[PDB]
Design an enzyme around this catalytic site. Structure first.
Site, PDB file in Angstrom:
ATOM      1  N   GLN A 180     -10.060  24.793 -13.805  1.00 29.84           N
ATOM      2  CA  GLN A 180     -10.743  24.545 -12.566  1.00 29.84           C
ATOM      3  C   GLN A 180      -9.787  23.815 -11.636  1.00 29.84           C
ATOM      4  O   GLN A 180      -8.693  23.412 -12.064  1.00 29.84           O
ATOM      5  CB  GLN A 180     -12.000  23.725 -12.835  1.00 29.84           C
ATOM      6  CG  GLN A 180     -12.916  24.357 -13.862  1.00 29.84           C
ATOM      7  CD  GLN A 180     -14.127  23.493 -14.119  1.00 29.84           C
ATOM      8  OE1 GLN A 180     -14.986  23.359 -13.252  1.00 29.84           O
ATOM      9  NE2 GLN A 180     -14.202  22.895 -15.298  1.00 29.84           N
ATOM     10  N   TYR A 235     -18.784  28.529 -27.638  1.00 34.18           N
ATOM     11  CA  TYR A 235     -17.484  28.373 -28.230  1.00 34.18           C
ATOM     12  C   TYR A 235     -17.131  26.879 -28.311  1.00 34.18           C
ATOM     13  O   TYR A 235     -17.521  26.105 -27.444  1.00 34.18           O
ATOM     14  CB  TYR A 235     -16.420  29.184 -27.475  1.00 34.18           C
ATOM     15  CG  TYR A 235     -16.244  28.836 -26.015  1.00 34.18           C
ATOM     16  CD1 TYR A 235     -15.329  27.871 -25.614  1.00 34.18           C
ATOM     17  CD2 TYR A 235     -16.958  29.502 -25.027  1.00 34.18           C
ATOM     18  CE1 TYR A 235     -15.133  27.573 -24.284  1.00 34.18           C
ATOM     19  CE2 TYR A 235     -16.785  29.189 -23.689  1.00 34.18           C
ATOM     20  CZ  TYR A 235     -15.862  28.230 -23.321  1.00 34.18           C
ATOM     21  OH  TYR A 235     -15.671  27.916 -21.981  1.00 34.18           O
ATOM     22  N   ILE A 246     -11.040  27.977 -20.850  1.00 35.16           N
ATOM     23  CA  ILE A 246     -11.836  26.989 -21.575  1.00 35.16           C
ATOM     24  C   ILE A 246     -12.569  26.135 -20.556  1.00 35.16           C
ATOM     25  O   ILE A 246     -11.957  25.443 -19.736  1.00 35.16           O
ATOM     26  CB  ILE A 246     -10.941  26.123 -22.489  1.00 35.16           C
ATOM     27  CG1 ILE A 246     -10.091  27.040 -23.402  1.00 35.16           C
ATOM     28  CG2 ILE A 246     -11.797  25.063 -23.250  1.00 35.16           C
ATOM     29  CD1 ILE A 246     -10.922  27.992 -24.304  1.00 35.16           C
ATOM     30  N   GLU A 247     -13.871  26.240 -20.540  1.00 36.14           N
ATOM     31  CA  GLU A 247     -14.676  25.661 -19.492  1.00 36.14           C
ATOM     32  C   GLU A 247     -15.533  24.471 -19.938  1.00 36.14           C
ATOM     33  O   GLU A 247     -16.149  23.795 -19.116  1.00 36.14           O
ATOM     34  CB  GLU A 247     -15.479  26.842 -18.901  1.00 36.14           C
ATOM     35  CG  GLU A 247     -16.107  26.646 -17.536  1.00 36.14           C
ATOM     36  CD  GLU A 247     -15.219  26.993 -16.373  1.00 36.14           C
ATOM     37  OE1 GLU A 247     -15.019  26.082 -15.532  1.00 36.14           O
ATOM     38  OE2 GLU A 247     -14.738  28.146 -16.305  1.00 36.14           O
ATOM     39  N   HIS A 248     -15.551  24.204 -21.237  1.00 36.88           N
ATOM     40  CA  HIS A 248     -16.254  23.043 -21.751  1.00 36.88           C
ATOM     41  C   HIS A 248     -15.648  22.682 -23.082  1.00 36.88           C
ATOM     42  O   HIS A 248     -14.951  23.504 -23.704  1.00 36.88           O
ATOM     43  CB  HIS A 248     -17.749  23.345 -21.924  1.00 36.88           C
ATOM     44  CG  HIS A 248     -18.045  24.361 -22.985  1.00 36.88           C
ATOM     45  ND1 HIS A 248     -18.526  25.623 -22.696  1.00 36.88           N
ATOM     46  CD2 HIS A 248     -17.936  24.303 -24.333  1.00 36.88           C
ATOM     47  CE1 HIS A 248     -18.681  26.306 -23.821  1.00 36.88           C
ATOM     48  NE2 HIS A 248     -18.326  25.529 -24.830  1.00 36.88           N
TER      49      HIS A 248
END
Length: 272
Positions: free
Chosen positions: A156, A81, A124-126
């Site tokens: 995070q 994504y 949203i991790e990246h």
């Protein structure tokens, strides 16, 4: 304490069904994950671990009849994504609105059938900030136009979050569940909650949102690090976290593992 617990669902083909999850009575929010493909020329796709999307329609309605809020989470721990252009953000906002957040429009089709979800979770991790702010601006605009739904986020535990920090600073999120795991700098470790308490203090003071939830793994196998037994969460964390006007409750990663460990059952006494 009359605790609200949010839980992620959808991470294993073999897991307790969405409706049985809701019938436990342990959870105020069930977050289905994830819409993990979008942006950069792709059409949107779900990866909900092989569960039938259409088969979820009646289970979601059942959850809602028992007053459990059901959200869809975008992004996730892995996935192709991205949201690099303003056109990506517009396309995705319009797609989520029409297909999940509004009643059916009788001709194009929806993933979850005629179910209408209670909101959208930004996991949203990246990618960095990208155009996520524009995405949130447009969804927020829809919220103001009559469609009543929640916007949440799962950053995070290092403040500010590199992917969502600037979006969180806009105050657009109704609630935030910080992942206090998979980072020894800000989560439980060694029988040493110092790092955890210091991060909680920062998040609860600085995050621009009405409710901040503490996110924990439901089982030692559920995350690489940060597992904290329920007796220690109750004894150590609750007394301090309850001094905060922003304390929302806890979030658990995830339903599959909570079924196994009964972590939520223990936190609540028994939760029946």
């Amino acid at each position: 304490a009359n605790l609200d617990i949010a839980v992620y669902w959808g991470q294993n083909f073999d897991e307790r069904s969405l409706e049985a999850t809701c019938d436990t009575g342990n959870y105020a929010y069930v977050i289905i994950g994830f819409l993990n493909t979008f942006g950069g020329g792709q059409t949107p796709a779900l990866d909900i671990s092989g569960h039938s999307p259409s088969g979820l329609e009646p289970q979601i309605k059942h959850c809602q009849s028992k007053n459990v809020k059901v959200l869809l989470s975008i992004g996730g721990p892995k996935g192709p994504y991205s949201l690099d252009s303003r056109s990506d953000a517009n396309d995705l906002a319009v797609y989520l609105f029409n297909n999940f957040l509004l009643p059916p429009g009788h001709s194009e089709n929806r993933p979850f059938g005629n179910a209408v979800l209670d909101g959208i979770d930004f996991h949203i991790e990246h990618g960095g900030p990208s155009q996520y702010q524009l995405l949130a601006n447009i969804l927020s605009s829809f919220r103001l136009a009559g469609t009543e739904f929640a916007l949440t986020a799962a950053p995070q535990c290092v403040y500010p979050d590199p992917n969502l920090g600037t979006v969180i600073n806009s105050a657009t999120f109704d609630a935030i569940w910080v992942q206090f795991y998979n980072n020894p700098q800000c989560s439980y470790s060694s029988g040493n909650a110092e790092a955890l308490m210091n991060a909680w203090r920062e998040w609860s003071m600085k995050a621009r949102t009405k409710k901040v939830f503490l996110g924990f793994p439901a089982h030692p196998d559920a995350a690489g690090s940060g597992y904290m037994p329920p007796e220690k969460v109750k004894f150590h964390v609750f007394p301090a976290a309850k001094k905060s006007y922003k304390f929302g409750g806890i979030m658990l990663w995830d339903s599959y593992w909570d079924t196994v460990s009964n972590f939520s059952s223990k936190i609540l006494g028994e939760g029946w």
